[PDB]
Amino acid sequence: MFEKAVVFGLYSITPVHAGSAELSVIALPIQRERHTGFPVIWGQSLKGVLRSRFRQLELDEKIEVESQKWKWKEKTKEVLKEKADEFIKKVEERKRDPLLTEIVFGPATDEHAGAVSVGDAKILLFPVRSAKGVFAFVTSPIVIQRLKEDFELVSEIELKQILSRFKVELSNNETIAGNALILNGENKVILEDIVLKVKSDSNVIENLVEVLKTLFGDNFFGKPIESIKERIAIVSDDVFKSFTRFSTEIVARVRIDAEKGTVARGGLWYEEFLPSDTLMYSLIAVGSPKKENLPKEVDNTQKIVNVLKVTFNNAFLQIGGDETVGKGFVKVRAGV
Amino acid sequence: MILVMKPYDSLLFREPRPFNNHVARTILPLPQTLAGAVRSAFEILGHFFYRYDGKFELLVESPHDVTQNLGLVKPHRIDKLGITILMDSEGIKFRPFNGFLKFSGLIDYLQGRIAEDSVVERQKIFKKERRVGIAEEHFYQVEMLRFSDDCGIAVWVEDGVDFDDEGILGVGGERRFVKFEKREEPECITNLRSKWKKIRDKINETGRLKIYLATPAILGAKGYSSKLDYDLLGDIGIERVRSVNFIGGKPVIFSGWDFVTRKPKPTRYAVPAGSVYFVEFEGEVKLDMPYLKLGKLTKLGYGLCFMGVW
Amino acid sequence: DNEFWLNKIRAFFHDPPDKSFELKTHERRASFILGELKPSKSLKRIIKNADIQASSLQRVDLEKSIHKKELKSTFDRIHNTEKYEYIGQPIIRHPVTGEIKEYGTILANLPQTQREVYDVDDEGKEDYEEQFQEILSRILKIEKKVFDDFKNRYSDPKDLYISLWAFYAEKLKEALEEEFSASFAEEFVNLPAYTLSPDHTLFDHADATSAIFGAEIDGKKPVLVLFKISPVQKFIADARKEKDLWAASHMLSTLTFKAISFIADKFGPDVVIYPHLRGNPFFHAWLHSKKIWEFSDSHSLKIASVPNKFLALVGVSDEKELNNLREGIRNEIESFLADLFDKLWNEVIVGALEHSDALKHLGDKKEIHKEILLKRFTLTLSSLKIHDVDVSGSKEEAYEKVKDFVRSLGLPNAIESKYLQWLDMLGSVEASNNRPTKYDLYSLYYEILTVLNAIESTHFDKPAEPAGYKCTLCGEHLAIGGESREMMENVWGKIHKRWPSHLRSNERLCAVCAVKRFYPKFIETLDIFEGVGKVVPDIESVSEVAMCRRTKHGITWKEVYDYLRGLKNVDDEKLLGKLENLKHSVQTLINNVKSELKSRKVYPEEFLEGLNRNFSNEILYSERLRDFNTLLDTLGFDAAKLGLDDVKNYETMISELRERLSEVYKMLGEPPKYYAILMMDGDEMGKLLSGEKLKTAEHYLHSAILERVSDALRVKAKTVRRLITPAAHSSISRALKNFSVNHVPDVVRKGNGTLIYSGGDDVLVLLPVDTAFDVATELAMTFSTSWNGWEMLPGNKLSAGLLIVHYKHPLYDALEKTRELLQKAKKLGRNAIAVGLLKRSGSYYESVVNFETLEDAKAVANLLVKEQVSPRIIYELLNFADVISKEFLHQLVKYEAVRHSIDKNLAEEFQSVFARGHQGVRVELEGNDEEINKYISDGANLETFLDKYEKAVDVIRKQVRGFLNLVKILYESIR
Numbered sequence A: 001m002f003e004k005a006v007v008f009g010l011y012s013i014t015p016v017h018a019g020s021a022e023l024s025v026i027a028l029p030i031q032r033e034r035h036t037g038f039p040v041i042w043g044q045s046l047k048g049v050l051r052s053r054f055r056q057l058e059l060d061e062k063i064e065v066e067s068q069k070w071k072w073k074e075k076t077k078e079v080l081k082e083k084a085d086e087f088i089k090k091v092e093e094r095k096r097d098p099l100l101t102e103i104v105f106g107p108a109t110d111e112h113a114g115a116v117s118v119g120d121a122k123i124l125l126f127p128v129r130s131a132k133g134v135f136a137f138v139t140s141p142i143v144i145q146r147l148k149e150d151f152e153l154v155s156e157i158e159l160k161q162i163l164s165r166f167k168v169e170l171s172n173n174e175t176i177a178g179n180a181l182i183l184n185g186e187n188k189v190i191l192e193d194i195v196l197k198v199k200s201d202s203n204v205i206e207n208l209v210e211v212l213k214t215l216f217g218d219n220f221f222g223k224p225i226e227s228i229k230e231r232i233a234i235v236s237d238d239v240f241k242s243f244t245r246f247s248t249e250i251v252a253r254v255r256i257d258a259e260k261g262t263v264a265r266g267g268l269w270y271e272e273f274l275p276s277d278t279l280m281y282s283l284i285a286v287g288s289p290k291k292e293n294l295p296k297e298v299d300n301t302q303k304i305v306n307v308l309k310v311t312f313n314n315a316f317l318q319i320g321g322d323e324t325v326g327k328g329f330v331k332v333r334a335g336v
Numbered sequence B: 001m002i003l004v005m006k007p008y009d010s011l012l013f014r015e016p017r018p019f020n021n022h023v024a025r026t027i028l029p030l031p032q033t034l035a036g037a038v039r040s041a042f043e044i045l046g047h048f049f050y051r052y053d054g055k056f057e058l059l060v061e062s063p064h065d066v067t068q069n070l071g072l073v074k075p076h077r078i079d080k081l082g083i084t085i086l087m088d089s090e091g092i093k094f095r096p097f098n099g100f101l102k103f104s105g106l107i108d109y110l111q112g113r114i115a116e117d118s119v120v121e122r123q124k125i126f127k128k129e130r131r132v133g134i135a136e137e138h139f140y141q142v143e144m145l146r147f148s149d150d151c152g153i154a155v156w157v158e159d160g161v162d163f164d165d166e167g168i169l170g171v172g173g174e175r176r177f178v179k180f181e182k183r184e185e186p187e188c189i190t191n192l193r194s195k196w197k198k199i200r201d202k203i204n205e206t207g208r209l210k211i212y213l214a215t216p217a218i219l220g221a222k223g224y225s226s227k228l229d230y231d232l233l234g235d236i237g238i239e240r241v242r243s244v245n246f247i248g249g250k251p252v253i254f255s256g257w258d259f260v261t262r263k264p265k266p267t268r269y270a271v272p273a274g275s276v277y278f279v280e281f282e283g284e285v286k287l288d289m290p291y292l293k294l295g296k297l298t299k300l301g302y303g304l305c306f307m308g309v310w
Numbered sequence C: 001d002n003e004f005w006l007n008k009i010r011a012f013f014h015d016p017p018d019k020s021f022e023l024k025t026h027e028r029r030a031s032f033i034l035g036e037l038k039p040s041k042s043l044k045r046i047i048k049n050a051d052i053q054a055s056s057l058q059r060v061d062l063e064k065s066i067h068k069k070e071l072k073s074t075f076d077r078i079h080n081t082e083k084y085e086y087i088g089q090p091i092i093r094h095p096v097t098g099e100i101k102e103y104g105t106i107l108a109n110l111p112q113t114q115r116e117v118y119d120v121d122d123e124g125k126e127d128y129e130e131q132f133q134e135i136l137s138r139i140l141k142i143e144k145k146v147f148d149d150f151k152n153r154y155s156d157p158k159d160l161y162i163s164l165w166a167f168y169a170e171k172l173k174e175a176l177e178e179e180f181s182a183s184f185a186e187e188f189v190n191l192p193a194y195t196l197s198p199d200h201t202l203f204d205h206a207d208a209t210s211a212i213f214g215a216e217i218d219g220k221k222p223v224l225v226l227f228k229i230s231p232v233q234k235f236i237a238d239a240r241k242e243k244d245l246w247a248a249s250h251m252l253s254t255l256t257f258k259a260i261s262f263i264a265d266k267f268g269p270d271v272v273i274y275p276h277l278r279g280n281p282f283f284h285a286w287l288h289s290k291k292i293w294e295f296s297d298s299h300s301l302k303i304a305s306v307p308n309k310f311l312a313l314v315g316v317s318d319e320k321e322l323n324n325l326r327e328g329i330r331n332e333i334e335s336f337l338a339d340l341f342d343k344l345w346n347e348v349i350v351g352a353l354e355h356s357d358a359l360k361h362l363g364d365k366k367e368i369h370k371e372i373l374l375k376r377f378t379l380t381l382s383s384l385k386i387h388d389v390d391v392s393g394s395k396e397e398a399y400e401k402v403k404d405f406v407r408s409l410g411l412p413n414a415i416e417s418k419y420l421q422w423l424d425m426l427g428s429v430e431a432s433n434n435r436p437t438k439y440d441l442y443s444l445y446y447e448i449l450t451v452l453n454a455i456e457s458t459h460f461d462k463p464a465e466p467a468g469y470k471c472t473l474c475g476e477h478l479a480i481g482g483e484s485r486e487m488m489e490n491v492w493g494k495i496h497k498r499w500p501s502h503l504r505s506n507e508r509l510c511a512v513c514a515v516k517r518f519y520p521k522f523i524e525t526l527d528i529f530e531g532v533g534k535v536v537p538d539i540e541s542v543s544e545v546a547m548c549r550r551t552k553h554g555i556t557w558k559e560v561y562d563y564l565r566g567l568k569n570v571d572d573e574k575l576l577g578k579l580e581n582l583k584h585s586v587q588t589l590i591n592n593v594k595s596e597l598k599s600r601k602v603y604p605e606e607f608l609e610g611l612n613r614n615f616s617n618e619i620l621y622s623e624r625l626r627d628f629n630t631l632l633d634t635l636g637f638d639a640a641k642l643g644l645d646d647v648k649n650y651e652t653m654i655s656e657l658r659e660r661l662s663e664v665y666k667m668l669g670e671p672p673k674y675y676a677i678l679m680m681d682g683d684e685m686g687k688l689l690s691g692e693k694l695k696t697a698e699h700y701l702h703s704a705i706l707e708r709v710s711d712a713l714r715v716k717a718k719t720v721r722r723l724i725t726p727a728a729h730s731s732i733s734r735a736l737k738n739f740s741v742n743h744v745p746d747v748v749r750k751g752n753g754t755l756i757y758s759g760g761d762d763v764l765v766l767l768p769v770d771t772a773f774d775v776a777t778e779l780a781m782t783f784s785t786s787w788n789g790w791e792m793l794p795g796n797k798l799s800a801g802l803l804i805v806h807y808k809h810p811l812y813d814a815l816e817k818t819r820e821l822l823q824k825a826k827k828l829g830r831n832a833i834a835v836g837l838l839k840r841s842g843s844y845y846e847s848v849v850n851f852e853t854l855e856d857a858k859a860v861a862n863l864l865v866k867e868q869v870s871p872r873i874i875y876e877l878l879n880f881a882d883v884i885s886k887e888f889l890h891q892l893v894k895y896e897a898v899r900h901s902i903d904k905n906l907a908e909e910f911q912s913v914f915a916r917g918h919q920g921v922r923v924e925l926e927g928n929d930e931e932i933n934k935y936i937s938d939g940a941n942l943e944t945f946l947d948k949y950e951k952a953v954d955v956i957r958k959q960v961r962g963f964l965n966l967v968k969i970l971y972e973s974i975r
C-alpha cells in the first residue's frame, strides 16, 4: 500500500496552539514529541483539518481537476446511481460526506479506508530572538537528518543524491549562521540569552536553502528565499531542544466579569503557543484509490496526488484551538 | 532476508481492552500485527529492533536471565532440600534487567558471559508517548511508541520469499506508515550460525540446555500454559529430560478482529518474550540451527527460541 | 483428633501467663492452670523439646550462660545467690527496633523493698515473700477461674481450643482489669516469654510453640508453606465505579481468607503466621459462622483486611499429604467460586431470559464460562520441607555439622556468611547441653520459600476461550453470549431491563466482570456473611467520596446528599429552607421520571420506586444537568434507545433546580470535583525479614546481661545481625495486624475517607482532597512508631503514592497512575511520598518528598490561606528554577519573600520554612545515582555531601522546582 507520497510545507502566519502532557507550567502545553521534545502536530489533527477543508471545498464546488471544475453532484450519480440521489440526502443530512472526501480523506463515521494517510508535522525552522538580525530560523543537525530520511522517499532525482552531503557535527556552544546574525567585531552570536561561537563553514546553509527553494519554489511563502539565507542558524541538539522547549509563547489569559470589573476568581491561566514564522513539514502517503468505480480522471495514484497538490498549494487553513482569537492560521505550499 | 522498517512517526498496537473508554494504552509489537504488514507487501522467523548509529546492530529483548548487574542466574538444586533455585552467584533474589541485547552480545550470552557494552537500556531504544484531547466528550488519550532517531523495527523472515525491495507501507494501529527496505543477512547472523556448531558441542558435552524465547509463544496444547511439554523437546533429539526450570513474566493476553469472519478471534495467552527455560537434557541435540519454533502460530513469528549453554 | 486438640491446648498453655513473675515453679503453675488437662511426663518432655527447639532459637541458646552462675532476671528477686546472679526487673524489647519498655504499674502493684536481691535465707524476706506469694496466688486463682469458665463454655476440644486461642488474652485482660486495674492488665498481657531475651511477649511464644508442636506430632515432618493468589493489580484495575473497586478488593480478600480458613480448620488458627488471624474481623466472622463466638460489630467488616499472600507452618508425613492439602485448598476456593458463579447464573442470567430462547442458545457455554472464571486466578502453594540436621554430637560437633550442612548448601557468599555468623554467635555460649535446633536457620528457609514463590507463581494455566466479542469492562475475556453480536446485545439489553439498578445495557460483560459487578448483592446471602450485618457500604461511586469534603460551615455535602433520600437528617437549621426546597424539586422530578418509566413499562416497578431513595448523585452536578438526555444518561438510562430525549417540556423544573442549586452554592459552595487516591506499601519487608535491616543481637537482649557474660559471647553478639524466629515472626505479624486493624481504619474514619484494603503493610484509601495530607503523615508516623501506648507497632518505613484526580477520570487509569506514583516513590529511595495532581484540563504535577517536608509545605499554605503572602511569589520563583544556584538561593528567596510579604515576620517565616522544606526532595538525575536520595531520606550533613558532590547545582535546582510544584499542588488542593 501507499505507492506514492507527497511533502506539505506549513508556515505559521499567526501563533498556533494545537492540542494539549506533563503541563508543568502551561495549563495547555503545545502538541509536543516525547523522545526529542520538538514541537509537532499529530497526524490525526492535521488529517482532520485537511479533510474538513476538503469537505467544505466539495460543498463549495471549487475543486477543479485538470483545469476543469469538479461537480460532485453529477459524479456521485454517475459512479453510484440507484440510491446515489438518496445518498445526496445523507450529505444534506450531514450524516455522511461528499464522495471525494470519502474516497480520499477517509470514510465517514460508519468497509473501506482512506486513500491518503496524513503523517506528523515535524518542525524544520524555529524562530528565536537574536541580538542582531532580529529573529533567526534555527535548526539542528538531526533535524536535517530527519529531513533527508523523509525526503529520500519522494524526490528520488539528483536532488536526493546531492542532499546526502548534509552531515555536520556541532558542540553544545558552537553554531553556524549567516552574516546577519553574527555580531559585528566579536565572532559570536546571542540567541535567547545564549551565546554561541560561529563555526566557519559555507556549505550546509547553502545546501539547506538550495533544497528548500528546489522543492518549495523561489518564493519562500511570500518572501524571497535569498533573504532567508542570511538569517539561518544551526545549533547543537541540546541547544535546539532547550530553544523549542522554552522559546515558545507563554501567554497569560484571564476572564473579567462586568459586574465588578475585575478578574474572575480562578479565571487566570497560562497557554503555550507555537511561535509564528515557523516552518514545518508533513508527509502525506497516498496509495491505490479504492475500487468503487472511480472516474478515469483520478483513476491512478499519480492523478490523485496531482489533484491534491494542485488543490492544496498556496492554501490557508487554521489548525488547533483558539481559532476565534486569530490563532492557528498557516499557509501550505505543496512540494512540486 | 531482513525487512528493515524505519518509522516516520509513532506506532500503535492496540491493547486487549476496548478503546466508550477513551483511555488507551500501548504494548510492544505483536507477531500477528507485523505479519499482516509483510503479507500486505510464507513464514516469519521473528522480529527484533535495529539501531543504526554509525554501525548497524540488531537488538532482541533482554533475557530474564540477565540481572541488573549483568549477572547471569543459573538454576542450582540442593539435594538436602531437593529443591532448585536460580542463584545469581551474588545473591539469592534478583530482578529481570529491562532493555535489549545485541546479536554481537547474544552470541557470547549463550556461552554464559555478557559484556556491559553488549546491552542497551530501554530508554535509549524507544519511549512511550501520550496524546490527550485527540478529538465535548469525544476526546480520547492514546499512548504510542516513539522510536529513537536512528532506530526501527527489523523483521527477520526466511530467505524463501521475495517481494518489493523498498517502499512505504502502513503498519500498527491508527493509520500510520513506515519506510521499509530489504536488507541482506548481516554479519551477526552469519557469526551466530558459524558458532552454532561450537555452542551445540558445548551443550552436548555439558548435558545442560537453555531455551531463550526471543518472541512470545503460545505453548498451550489444550488450553494455554507456560509448562514445557516433554514431547516438544524430544523432537529435537532429547532422549530424556530430568528437570525443567522456567522463569518469565506475566503472560501476554491478546486477541484480534478477524475480518474474514467479521468476528473477534479467540483470546489467547502467550509466554512473554525474554523468558528462559533451563532443561537438563539426556543425549544430544540434533537441531542444525540455533533457532527453533515452538507452540502454535509459528509462521506469524511466534515462539522463536535460541539455544544456550550453562 | 480430640486428643490432638487437647494436646494443642496443652502446648499453648505449656507456660503460665505469669511465667516471668517466678521461674522457680513456673511448670507447677502451668500444670495447675490446665487442671484436669495437665500433660503427662512424656507429653511435657515433648512440649519442652518443641519449645526449646524453634520458638526463639536465640532465647534458649542464650539462657544457658554459665559465667560463674546461670543468669536470672525475674520479678522473684529471691534466688540462690551462690550460682544465679540476679540481674534486675524484666523488660520488653521491640522485635524489630529493639525499643525498651518497662512495667511501671506492675512494679507499683508489686511490693517494693530496699534490697534489690534477696538470698535463699535473707533477713527480712518473710513479709516480702508472703506478699509475693499472696499476689501470685491471686493471679493464679483469677487465671484458673477464667480458664475454668472458658472450658465449661465449650465441650468440643477443637472449638474449645480455637476459642481459647482467639480470646483467652482478652478474657484474662478484662478479668485482671476488673480486679487489679486496666493498666495492670494491659502491662501484664504484654509480659515477655523469655526474660533474658524479651524480643517477644509470652502469648506470641505460646502460639509459636503450639504451631511447632502441631508441626511435629505423630512423627509428621514440619513444612513451611506459602500460598499466593495472583495477579491482583490487574483484577482491581478493571472497574467503572468505586463500588466495583470495593467489590474486587473485598472478593480477593474473601478468597484468600477462605483458603486461610480451610488451613486453620484443618490444623489450627495458630499454624498461620502471616497475616496474624487473631483480632482480624474476617476471623471473627468465621468464628461466628462456626457458632463458636457470637460476633460483635465492634470492627467494621466492610474492609478487605486480608492480604493475597499467606504463610503457614504445618506438619505433614510426606509430600503426598502436601499435595492433598494443596488440592483441598484449590477444591475449597473453586467450590466457593463455582457457588458464586451458579448463584449469578441462576439468579441474574436466567432472571431476564426465563422464557426467551436466548437462554437456551447461551446455555451451551455454561461450562466454558465456569472454566474461564475458575481458572482466572493462579494459585501457588510453595512448600519447603524443613530439614532435620543431626545434632547427635557435642556442642562443638553439632555446630560444626550444622555449619558444614550450610556450606553444603552452596549459596551466594553474602547470605552464607551472614548465616555462618549467626550460627557462630549461637555457638559462642558456654553450655554442655547447648545444641543448635533445626529451626536455627528458619529465616533461611523462609527466604528460599519466598524465592520459590517468585518463580512458582510465574507459571500459569488458562483455558482455551472461544471466539467472540470481548468484555467491555475487563477487555480480556469473551463476553457472555459472545456467539453473535446481535444476540449478545439483545441478551444484555434484557438483563439491563431486569437489572437496571447497576448494569448498563451497552455494557456486555464477561463472567469475572459480571461477578465483580453483582458481588455486593450476593455477599450478604453467602457464607461467612449473612449473620454479621452491614457488610455492603453505602458508597458506590467516587462522586460521593469526592463530595465528602469538609467545608467551612462544618457540613459535608455527602451528608446532605444522603439527607435527600432521608437516610440522615440535617442538624443545621440555617439552610433548612433551601434543603427542603431542593428536596421538593428532587421529589417532583423523581415522580415525573417514575411516571414516565411506568408508562414505558421496560423496568420492574420496584426499581423505579426505589430510585426515589437510590437516585444517582451525579445529577447534583449542574454541568451534568444540561438537558433531559443528559439527565437520563446520568441516571443510568440510554435515552437513545428509550427515545425520551425528545421531551422538551421538562426544562422548567430543570432550570428552577439549577437556580436553587446556585442559591445553595451561594452560602455553601459547589461540590468539590477532586478526590485523593492514596496507596502505601511497606519498605523492604523482605530485607527486614532477611535480617539485613535487623539490628545486632545486643539490641534484642536484656540491658544488663551483655556486660555479665563471656567476652567471646559479648563480641559475637555486638557484631552479628539478629535473625527472625517463629516467635519473633509471630510478634512482627501481630504488630502488623495491630497497625492494619486497630489504627488505619480509625484514622481513615476520623479523616472522613473510605479505606478499601488494609492488609498488613499495604493500605489503600480514597479521601476528600483536604483530608489526605492530614492522614498520610499520621499513618507514616504510626507505621514508623515502635511502641504506641502498650500495644506493638511495626516500626518500619513507608512508601506512599497520592493522586488528586477528578471523579470523571476512568477508574483503572487513575489506579495505574497511583501505582506508578508509588513505584516511582520506591525508585527514588524509600520512606517517602510521591504526590501528583492530575487537574481536569491538562495539568499534571509530581513531587517525591520525605514525609517531614510535607507538613512544612502545609505551612506556606497558611500564608496562602489568608493571603499573608501573594501566590505570585511561587510563579516568579519558578522562573528562577532553571538558573538558581546554591550560593545565592537564600538571599534571592529572602528578597522575594520581603517583596511579596506585607510583614517582615511573614517574610522571615517563609524564608525559614522554604529553606527547611526544600532540603528534602527526591531528585531524578540523568545518571543512575541513588546515593543522593539516600542522603536526603535519612537527614544528615547532606549540605556537606552536596558540597563534596559534583552535580550540586542540578540537584538543588531539581529540589527547589519539586518543592515549588508540591507547594502549588497543595495550595490548589486547599482552594
Ligand SMILES: Nc1ncnc2c1ncn2[C@@H]1O[C@H](COP(=O)(O)OP(=O)(O)OP(=O)(O)O)[C@@H](O)[C@H]1O
Residues within 6 Å of the ligand: C230, C231, C232, C233, C236, C248, C249, C250, C252, C253, C304, C306, C307, C308, C681, C757, C759, C762, C764
Ligand atoms: N485485596 C486487595 N486489595 C488491594 N490491594 C491488594 C489486595 N491484595 C493484595 N493487594 C496488594 O496489591 C499488590 C498486588 O500484589 P502482587 O502479588 O500482584 O504483587 P506485584 O509486586 O504487583 O507483582 P507479582 O504479581 O509478580 O507478585 C500488592 O502490593 C498487594 O499487597
Ligand SMILES: Nc1ncnc2c1ncn2[C@@H]1O[C@H](COP(=O)(O)OP(=O)(O)OP(=O)(O)O)[C@@H](O)[C@H]1O
Residues within 6 Å of the ligand: C273, C274, C307, C309, C311, C681, C682, C683, C684, C685, C686, C687, C732, C733, C736, C760, C761, C799, C826, C830
Ligand atoms: N509479616 C510478614 N510475614 C510474611 N510476609 C510478609 C509479611 N509482611 C509482608 N509480607 C509480604 O512480603 C512481601 C513484600 O513484597 P514487596 O513488594 O512489598 O517488597 P519489599 O521487600 O517489602 O520491599 P519494596 O516493596 O520496598 O521493594 C509481600 O508479598 C507481603 O505480603
Ligand SMILES: [Mg+2]
Residues within 6 Å of the ligand: C681, C682, C683, C684, C685, C686
Ligand atoms: Mg515492600
Ligand SMILES: [Zn+2]
Residues within 6 Å of the ligand: C471, C472, C473, C474, C475, C476, C477, C509, C510, C511, C512, C513, C514
Ligand atoms: Zn470482563
